[PDB]
Amino acid sequence: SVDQKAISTIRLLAVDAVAAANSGHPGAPLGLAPAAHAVFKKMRFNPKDTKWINRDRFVLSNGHACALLYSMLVLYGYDLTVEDLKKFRQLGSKTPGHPENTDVPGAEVTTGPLGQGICNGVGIALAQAQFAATYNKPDFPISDSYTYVFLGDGCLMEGVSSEASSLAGHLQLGNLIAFWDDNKISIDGSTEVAFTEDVIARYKSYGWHIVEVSDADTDITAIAAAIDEAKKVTNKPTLVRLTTTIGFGSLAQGTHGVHGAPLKADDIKQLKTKWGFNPEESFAVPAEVTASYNEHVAENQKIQQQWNELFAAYKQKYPELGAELQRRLDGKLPENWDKALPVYTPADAAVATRKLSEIVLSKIIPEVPEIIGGSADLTPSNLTKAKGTVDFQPAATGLGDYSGRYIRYGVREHAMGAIMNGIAAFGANYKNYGGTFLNFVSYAAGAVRLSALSEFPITWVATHDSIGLGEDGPTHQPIETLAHFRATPNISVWRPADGNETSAAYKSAIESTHTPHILALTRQNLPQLEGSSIEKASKGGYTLVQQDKADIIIVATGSEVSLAVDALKVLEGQGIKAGVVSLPDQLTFDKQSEEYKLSVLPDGVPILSVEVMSTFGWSKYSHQQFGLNRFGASGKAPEIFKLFEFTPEGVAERAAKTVAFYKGKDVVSPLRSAF
Amino acid sequence: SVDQKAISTIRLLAVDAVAAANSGHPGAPLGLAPAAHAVFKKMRFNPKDTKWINRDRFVLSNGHACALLYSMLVLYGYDLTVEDLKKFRQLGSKTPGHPENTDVPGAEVTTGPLGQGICNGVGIALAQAQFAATYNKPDFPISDSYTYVFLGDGCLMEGVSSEASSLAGHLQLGNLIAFWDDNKISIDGSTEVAFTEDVIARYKSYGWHIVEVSDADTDITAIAAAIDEAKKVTNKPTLVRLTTTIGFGSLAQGTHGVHGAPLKADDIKQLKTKWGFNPEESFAVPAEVTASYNEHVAENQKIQQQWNELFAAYKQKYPELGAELQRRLDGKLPENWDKALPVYTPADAAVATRKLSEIVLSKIIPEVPEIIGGSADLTPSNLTKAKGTVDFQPAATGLGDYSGRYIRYGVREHAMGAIMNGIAAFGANYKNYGGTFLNFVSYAAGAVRLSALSEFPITWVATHDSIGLGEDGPTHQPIETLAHFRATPNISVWRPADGNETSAAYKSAIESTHTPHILALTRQNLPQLEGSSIEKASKGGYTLVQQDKADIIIVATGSEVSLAVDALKVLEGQGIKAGVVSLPDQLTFDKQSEEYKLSVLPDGVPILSVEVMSTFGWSKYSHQQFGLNRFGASGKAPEIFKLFEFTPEGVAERAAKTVAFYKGKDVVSPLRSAF
Ligand SMILES: CC1=C(CCOP(=O)(O)OP(=O)(O)O)S[C@@H](O)N1Cc1cnc(C)nc1N
Ligand SMILES: CC1=C(CCOP(=O)(O)OP(=O)(O)O)S[C@@H](O)N1Cc1cnc(C)nc1N
Ligand SMILES: [Ca+2]
Ligand SMILES: [Ca+2]
């Protein structure tokens, strides 16, 4: 039949791509081609408009299987061709060895690190539910799309997927439909060696609906029926068990050897002849398959055409909501939204930056509807919920509504990070955030790194940033954490010192379109600084205290800026004149012009950094570094600062030693380099 | 009764400790005191010998509840007193705000980061099973101890605990008995807001046995009976559901407010009078409670006395095993074990460092019985299994035996990391390891950091270290990873360049007693270096190529050392004389004498670092840094190195620019500092 021919075409495109690269993963593509065919036939999408907001989304969580995804995208006439398939896994191609949303049209998210994609799918589905609750009206189903996810045994073993699956079940996300590739093979062989749990029973325990397809190597009728069944269960996410043979059709089917290396040439020949293809030909695309797939595209395009007319009629019936929706689909924040950001003067009281963050959120959430966010069971500690908002919960629980704006993630940092990526991936200008203690952002590193690689404007509200948290002690006190994330490409790591800097950090985080943000915030109160402003802090680094005859410049962040200012006064009594630089975000600073940066960190003066965590990275900006390169302690925070000599006198002593060390030396800016 | 008085004593010690600190967590201690009393009465332990190898182990996974643990340890006469309780959460005390194994007698592991302790308990139980299978003989139950773990809702939400619980069920670890504090309260309030899964059904799906105690606020008879029941189920780990009231007895019982802040003074008074204590008194220890607890200690000490005689008789009946066991309990490796380490010359073939690692393991595993380890579903990629060894599996599966040495962790990096910590915590000189790709060690950061803080000699076999892995692309290629772990205190991060350096890295990792190791290993082949040796590489950094008239020194690691040597030859043709330093472990190097370090990185010569990952940290050792501070690419590895100019000519160009940049300047070693 044409459907059988399409499935064979998909299988053989994937195998031929792996063969051409002499690299990659043929097994899961062979096993999942029937399901991919069936799911894409049910999906609504436009290959010529990858951003249609009411499209169904597809996520390949088992991202190593991407020859399958690329084959689907090629067959459906996305901006990806057979010539791109021939360049699978080749430097610079549009067909990288794992899918990247920045590079691959029709890749919603970046997968490959196992477990991430299913969590991203939870976030896409969460966003869709929130979006539909916000905009849909009687006779106006603006948003009614589904989220389809493929995942394998590896994703099911990774703890992040358990976190997200527990939460998705709690949230009753009925438009999420996931498909488990139940092939009983991973890299180490049979799943009997390490993965003998009853997956189905576990998913029932989370509140998911289950459909089992016992012959998913052939039974596309049953796969389609499973989708129809899942769509009828509106208050539970569904897991469809696809019992498949890894490498179906290969001489090596059902073995670990077919997972992750090219097939033998003779194996590819017998695949082709068994399925009616020419064993001498590669990258075959039968015209009847193209015709069948084109019919579905044309139908989908007529659906989008009608949606566009629905949207026009919505703008007439609901003028304010329609304009808001239009603005969001245009990627624009509300005009002058930033006028809501709080501004402070040096006469205002000291405030912890976690509390300044609460105040910002309280002002901007009512003004910017596309802001939603939550906390990983730290709401009263991170201060992430604006008073008067409702939680995102299914109304059936009585605990919230899908129109709500605040997410109770539970103690699930890693899934929170990956769900945030999915909310961003949904689109519609969502600017979403997640709170935890800074030290436990590290639990979510797998997802955080993908925020950076995927260029998603997500925000971590990362409170209790240092030994300043006090008594909880060294298991809670960051040392390495900022260095880790600053060393990752494309992460803005804001460590604001005061009220104006906190507003600048949020301006950056909310305006972002391509860069994730981590906001490192204090437990403890900090003074409002003389010389701070949103304008200056928006440059990432700025001269807080200018001293034309400086003997030294002290560069600091966060809680250590006030310390530097107090040290400047001690130094004055020692006959040493200091300037102070505040560096609330190193990435933003790095992006400023060379001349601006040199105005902050000039030649001809020693520069000392002060930050109560690792000294890694700080030599970019300083000649000498005063940091904390050992674990912390359990005690009252001021006593810990004293123990480690993070006091005005301790900073002044090191500043004086720095001045002495450079006596008789020629000093150039740390910004200078040989290449 | 005396038992009732003991429970009240525990509750009130915990509340009084929190009160004295005006900080900490009274709720779970109040709720779990009956269970703690019951479990400790069943446990075999010696407060005067915390290292008795046949003790039962206890782990408080909900580590914030540590006022409970400290109260138990004080009551039982560990090296912890009421005076220490009065110093709870105070700087320098033996009663930190979360338990630390380095600081607290009777704390087996360091907890506080949720989810870790239960996984550590899985590792203690895994080790006990392996140890018993190795040493027990008829009439000689050398090892027959249990592992008791308390955990809360937060631990159950963290994905790491799902990973470890799936694996523990697969492994049929019948001597593991965990207790869930089912109090339905976390920081954000009721668990109804975020955690509505059927926990019991999930644990059944993993293959655990369940016992439910519906009135765990009072029913110590049922808690004791649950332990007895769990001990009869020898082929399943057991979860005991303890339905408790958080803060039991407080006016604020059953509320989130009792979780994490001191009780009001009037509340403490009414607790005391309800339970027959003097409301004017704090830190009361009734002598009848001490007497009862002392009776159990005395009985346990007679059990250990008899075990010592059993061990003496074992040494007579089984002379070789007995001597091996004695050596391990003395903390000593086999005499001259390191003579098994492979040695290479520059005439030997190029080898990838992952393959060199396989060869090391193959030589040392037969010689050092306390080495066990595994991989997170990457055995044929990491090359972590020695041919001819058997996997650690329950014999009932037919897939291995508990005497086996190789663990199939599945796709569970985070739990693997925390399980490794538990295996180390068991003791008996275990030197255990875990393989994954370097980029996915990051999934396990929560546990890795605790290896460092806990001072456990665990080893990550972290292969596919860089863009050298090629086609899998940027989702798999480390950039930030070494900087992250090098910035963490107390992590040795070895990046060996060749065969001799790989042997030095393993010598360090296996000899370690207090420092975790990460071995960053290549996919791709590297040449054997002229000038390398185990002796020199054991110093962490060494002069590979000495040049008395050097214009520049190039310092490099791993795959970039050979690149530096090739660049030296290009530079010679440009009239520039270079030396080369290899820096296989920065931590080991840092620990050498100042004079040794200066002999490697002297004054008076520019130093350029080369390493194909982040430049963070490298200014400790260099004036200029050539690194990779952007994400990678999907293509054949040599083409990626060329793209980024990590070629002999690209290094030489940057070296020449470095020489030019320092013309006319006075240069001192990067090792010099102002303070
Ligand atoms: C183990 C592993 C794989 C097997 C999947 O086994 P699974 O059953 O999911 O795939 P199948 O055998 O094709 O059906 S792929 C490769 O990613 N990898 C390394 C890998 C490990 N850890 C993480 C976080 N991401 C990864 N990418
Ligand atoms: C959320 C959170 C807690 C509530 C536990 O809720 P749980 O039900 O386990 O404790 P109970 O309410 O006392 O019964 S504690 C504090 O650790 N914390 C922050 C916290 C967050 N993430 C990680 C990895 N470790 C942590 N430590
Ligand atoms: Ca599989
Ligand atoms: Ca709880």
Side-chain angles (χ1 to χ4, degrees), chain B residues 355-385:
Chain B
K355 179 64 174 188
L356 294 163
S357 171
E358 189 189 67
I359 295 164
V360 172
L361 289 168
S362 83
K363 299 309 180 190
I364 68 174
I365 283 170
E367 304 280 344
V368 184
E370 59 262 54
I371 298 174
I372 65 175
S375 175
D377 199 51
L378 285 170
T379 297
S381 300
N382 301 153
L383 307 178
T384 34
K385 183 173 180 178

Short mmCIF file of all heavy atoms in Angstrom, two decimals, chain B residues 355-385:
data_model
loop_
_atom_site.label_atom_id
_atom_site.label_comp_id
_atom_site.label_asym_id
_atom_site.label_seq_id
_atom_site.Cartn_x
_atom_site.Cartn_y
_atom_site.Cartn_z
N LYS B 355 40.79 3.54 26.09
CA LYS B 355 41.30 2.18 25.92
C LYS B 355 42.45 1.92 26.90
O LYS B 355 42.56 0.83 27.47
CB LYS B 355 41.72 1.98 24.46
CG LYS B 355 42.28 0.60 24.18
CD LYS B 355 41.26 -0.53 24.39
CE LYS B 355 41.78 -1.87 23.96
NZ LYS B 355 40.69 -2.90 24.00
N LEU B 356 43.31 2.93 27.11
CA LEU B 356 44.34 2.80 28.14
C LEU B 356 43.70 2.52 29.49
O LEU B 356 44.21 1.70 30.27
CB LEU B 356 45.22 4.04 28.18
CG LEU B 356 46.06 4.23 26.91
CD1 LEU B 356 46.57 5.65 26.83
CD2 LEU B 356 47.22 3.21 26.89
N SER B 357 42.59 3.20 29.80
CA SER B 357 41.84 2.96 31.03
C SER B 357 41.36 1.52 31.11
O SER B 357 41.52 0.86 32.15
CB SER B 357 40.69 3.96 31.07
OG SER B 357 39.79 3.69 32.11
N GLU B 358 40.74 1.00 30.04
CA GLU B 358 40.34 -0.40 30.01
C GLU B 358 41.51 -1.31 30.36
O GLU B 358 41.37 -2.28 31.14
CB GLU B 358 39.82 -0.78 28.63
CG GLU B 358 39.20 -2.16 28.62
CD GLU B 358 38.89 -2.64 27.25
OE1 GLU B 358 39.86 -2.87 26.52
OE2 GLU B 358 37.69 -2.82 26.94
N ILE B 359 42.68 -1.05 29.76
CA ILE B 359 43.85 -1.90 30.00
C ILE B 359 44.28 -1.81 31.46
O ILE B 359 44.59 -2.83 32.08
CB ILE B 359 44.97 -1.54 29.00
CG1 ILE B 359 44.55 -1.87 27.57
CG2 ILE B 359 46.28 -2.25 29.38
CD1 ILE B 359 45.41 -1.22 26.52
N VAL B 360 44.33 -0.60 32.03
CA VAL B 360 44.64 -0.47 33.46
C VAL B 360 43.69 -1.32 34.29
O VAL B 360 44.11 -2.09 35.15
CB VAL B 360 44.61 0.99 33.93
CG1 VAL B 360 44.73 1.03 35.44
CG2 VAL B 360 45.68 1.84 33.29
N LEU B 361 42.38 -1.12 34.09
CA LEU B 361 41.39 -1.86 34.88
C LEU B 361 41.60 -3.36 34.76
O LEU B 361 41.49 -4.10 35.74
CB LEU B 361 39.98 -1.45 34.43
CG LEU B 361 39.56 -0.03 34.82
CD1 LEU B 361 38.28 0.35 34.06
CD2 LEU B 361 39.37 0.13 36.32
N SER B 362 41.91 -3.83 33.55
CA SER B 362 42.13 -5.25 33.31
C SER B 362 43.30 -5.79 34.11
O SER B 362 43.31 -6.97 34.47
CB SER B 362 42.36 -5.52 31.81
OG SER B 362 43.73 -5.31 31.34
N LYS B 363 44.32 -4.96 34.35
CA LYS B 363 45.48 -5.39 35.12
C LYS B 363 45.27 -5.27 36.61
O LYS B 363 45.79 -6.10 37.37
CB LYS B 363 46.72 -4.58 34.72
CG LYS B 363 47.15 -4.71 33.27
CD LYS B 363 47.29 -6.11 32.79
CE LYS B 363 47.72 -6.09 31.33
NZ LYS B 363 47.65 -7.44 30.72
N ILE B 364 44.54 -4.25 37.07
CA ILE B 364 44.48 -4.01 38.50
C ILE B 364 43.29 -4.68 39.17
O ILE B 364 43.39 -5.04 40.35
CB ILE B 364 44.59 -2.51 38.87
CG1 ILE B 364 43.38 -1.69 38.43
CG2 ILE B 364 45.89 -1.94 38.29
CD1 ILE B 364 43.40 -0.24 38.90
N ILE B 365 42.17 -4.87 38.47
CA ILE B 365 41.02 -5.55 39.07
C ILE B 365 41.40 -6.92 39.62
O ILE B 365 41.04 -7.22 40.77
CB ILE B 365 39.84 -5.54 38.09
CG1 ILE B 365 39.20 -4.15 38.11
CG2 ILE B 365 38.84 -6.66 38.39
CD1 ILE B 365 38.17 -3.93 37.00
N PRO B 366 42.16 -7.76 38.91
CA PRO B 366 42.53 -9.07 39.49
C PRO B 366 43.43 -8.96 40.70
O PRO B 366 43.53 -9.92 41.47
CB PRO B 366 43.24 -9.78 38.33
CG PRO B 366 42.78 -9.10 37.11
CD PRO B 366 42.51 -7.68 37.48
N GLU B 367 44.14 -7.86 40.86
CA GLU B 367 45.11 -7.67 41.93
C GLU B 367 44.54 -6.97 43.15
O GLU B 367 45.16 -7.06 44.22
CB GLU B 367 46.30 -6.86 41.41
CG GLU B 367 46.98 -7.46 40.19
CD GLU B 367 47.91 -8.57 40.54
OE1 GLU B 367 48.28 -8.68 41.73
OE2 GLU B 367 48.29 -9.33 39.62
N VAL B 368 43.42 -6.28 43.01
CA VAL B 368 42.90 -5.42 44.07
C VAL B 368 41.42 -5.73 44.23
O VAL B 368 40.58 -5.14 43.53
CB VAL B 368 43.14 -3.94 43.75
CG1 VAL B 368 42.68 -3.10 44.93
CG2 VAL B 368 44.60 -3.66 43.43
N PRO B 369 41.06 -6.65 45.13
CA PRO B 369 39.67 -7.13 45.18
C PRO B 369 38.67 -6.06 45.58
O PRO B 369 37.49 -6.17 45.23
CB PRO B 369 39.72 -8.28 46.20
CG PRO B 369 40.92 -8.01 47.00
CD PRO B 369 41.93 -7.41 46.04
N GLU B 370 39.11 -5.03 46.29
CA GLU B 370 38.23 -3.96 46.72
C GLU B 370 37.86 -2.97 45.61
O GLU B 370 37.10 -2.04 45.86
CB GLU B 370 38.80 -3.22 47.93
CG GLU B 370 40.18 -2.58 47.72
CD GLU B 370 41.32 -3.47 48.25
OE1 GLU B 370 41.39 -4.66 47.87
OE2 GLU B 370 42.11 -2.95 49.07
N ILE B 371 38.37 -3.17 44.38
CA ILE B 371 37.88 -2.40 43.24
C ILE B 371 36.62 -3.06 42.70
O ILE B 371 36.63 -4.23 42.29
CB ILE B 371 38.93 -2.28 42.13
CG1 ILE B 371 40.17 -1.53 42.63
CG2 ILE B 371 38.31 -1.58 40.92
CD1 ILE B 371 41.31 -1.49 41.64
N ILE B 372 35.52 -2.28 42.65
CA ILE B 372 34.32 -2.65 41.92
C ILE B 372 33.87 -1.39 41.18
O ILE B 372 34.25 -0.27 41.55
CB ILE B 372 33.18 -3.21 42.81
CG1 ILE B 372 32.62 -2.18 43.79
CG2 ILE B 372 33.65 -4.48 43.53
CD1 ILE B 372 31.42 -2.67 44.58
N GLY B 373 33.05 -1.54 40.15
CA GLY B 373 32.57 -0.35 39.47
C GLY B 373 31.60 -0.71 38.38
O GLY B 373 31.21 -1.86 38.24
N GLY B 374 31.20 0.29 37.59
CA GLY B 374 30.23 0.04 36.56
C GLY B 374 30.15 1.20 35.58
O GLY B 374 31.03 2.06 35.54
N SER B 375 29.08 1.19 34.78
CA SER B 375 28.82 2.25 33.82
C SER B 375 27.33 2.49 33.74
O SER B 375 26.52 1.58 33.95
CB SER B 375 29.35 1.87 32.41
OG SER B 375 29.01 2.84 31.42
N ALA B 376 27.00 3.73 33.38
CA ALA B 376 25.61 4.15 33.18
C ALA B 376 25.20 3.89 31.73
O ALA B 376 25.05 4.79 30.90
CB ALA B 376 25.45 5.61 33.59
N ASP B 377 25.04 2.59 31.41
CA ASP B 377 24.64 2.14 30.06
C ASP B 377 25.64 2.54 28.98
O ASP B 377 25.24 2.72 27.83
CB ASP B 377 23.24 2.61 29.66
CG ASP B 377 22.63 1.79 28.51
OD1 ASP B 377 22.66 0.53 28.63
OD2 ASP B 377 22.10 2.38 27.54
N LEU B 378 26.92 2.61 29.32
CA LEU B 378 27.94 2.96 28.35
C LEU B 378 29.13 2.00 28.42
O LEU B 378 30.26 2.36 28.07
CB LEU B 378 28.37 4.43 28.44
CG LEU B 378 27.35 5.42 27.86
CD1 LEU B 378 27.77 6.83 28.22
CD2 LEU B 378 27.25 5.25 26.35
N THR B 379 28.89 0.76 28.82
CA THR B 379 30.00 -0.18 29.00
C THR B 379 30.88 -0.34 27.76
O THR B 379 32.11 -0.28 27.90
CB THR B 379 29.44 -1.51 29.52
OG1 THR B 379 28.87 -1.26 30.81
CG2 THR B 379 30.53 -2.56 29.67
N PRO B 380 30.34 -0.56 26.56
CA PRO B 380 31.21 -0.74 25.39
C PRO B 380 31.79 0.55 24.85
O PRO B 380 32.56 0.49 23.89
CB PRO B 380 30.30 -1.41 24.38
CG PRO B 380 28.96 -0.94 24.75
CD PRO B 380 28.92 -0.82 26.22
N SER B 381 31.38 1.70 25.38
CA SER B 381 31.89 3.00 24.96
C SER B 381 32.92 3.53 25.95
O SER B 381 33.97 4.04 25.55
CB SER B 381 30.75 4.01 24.83
OG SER B 381 29.81 3.57 23.89
N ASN B 382 32.63 3.42 27.24
CA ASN B 382 33.57 3.82 28.28
C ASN B 382 34.71 2.80 28.47
O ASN B 382 35.77 3.16 28.99
CB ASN B 382 32.88 3.96 29.64
CG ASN B 382 31.73 4.96 29.73
OD1 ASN B 382 30.85 4.78 30.56
ND2 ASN B 382 31.74 6.01 28.91
N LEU B 383 34.44 1.54 28.13
CA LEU B 383 35.41 0.44 28.23
C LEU B 383 35.78 0.15 29.69
O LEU B 383 36.95 -0.01 30.05
CB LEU B 383 36.64 0.65 27.35
CG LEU B 383 36.34 0.95 25.89
CD1 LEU B 383 37.65 1.20 25.15
CD2 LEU B 383 35.56 -0.16 25.23
N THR B 384 34.74 0.06 30.52
CA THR B 384 34.89 -0.01 31.97
C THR B 384 34.84 -1.42 32.55
O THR B 384 35.07 -1.55 33.77
CB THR B 384 33.78 0.86 32.62
OG1 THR B 384 32.59 0.81 31.83
CG2 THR B 384 34.22 2.30 32.73
N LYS B 385 34.54 -2.44 31.76
CA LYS B 385 34.45 -3.80 32.27
C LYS B 385 35.69 -4.60 31.87
O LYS B 385 36.02 -4.70 30.67
CB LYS B 385 33.20 -4.53 31.77
CG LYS B 385 33.09 -5.93 32.36
CD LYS B 385 31.78 -6.63 32.04
CE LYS B 385 31.79 -8.02 32.67
NZ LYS B 385 30.53 -8.73 32.44
#
